[PDB]
């Protein structure tokens, strides 16, 4: 298939587009990170309604002590909750 070819195109075009809306051309900040997820991954990744999730994940996801998140850190932890949460589905209801 040609699905994966498009997959990489979607991830990076949106990553650098909003990541440089007010911060740096290609570095994320706590404020760029939460807006990027509430934008298209709604109901999948949460940050606005769960405040504990933002400070605990973002501050510790910058495990290097960078109040800014790199693209590599964002894809690993955010993609974990992406496939993990989907598996539970409503079946966990």
């Amino acid at each position: 298939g040609s699905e994966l070819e498009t997959a990489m195109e979607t991830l990076i075009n949106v990553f650098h587009a909003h990541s440089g809306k007010e911060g740096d051309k290609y570095k994320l900040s706590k404020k760029e990170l939460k807006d990027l997820l509430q934008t298209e991954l709604s109901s999948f990744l949460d940050v606005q309604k769960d405040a504990d999730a933002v400070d605990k994940i973002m501050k510790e996801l910058d495990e290097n002590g960078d109040g800014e998140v790199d693209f590599q850190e964002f894809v690993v932890l955010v993609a974990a909750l992406t496939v993990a949460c989907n598996n539970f589905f409503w079946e966990n209801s």
Partner: peptide
């Protein structure tokens, strides 16, 4: 990482 992972999924 795994230890705190339980908190997010448990607390969610």
């Amino acid at each position: 990482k795994k230890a705190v992972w339980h908190k997010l999924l448990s607390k969610q």
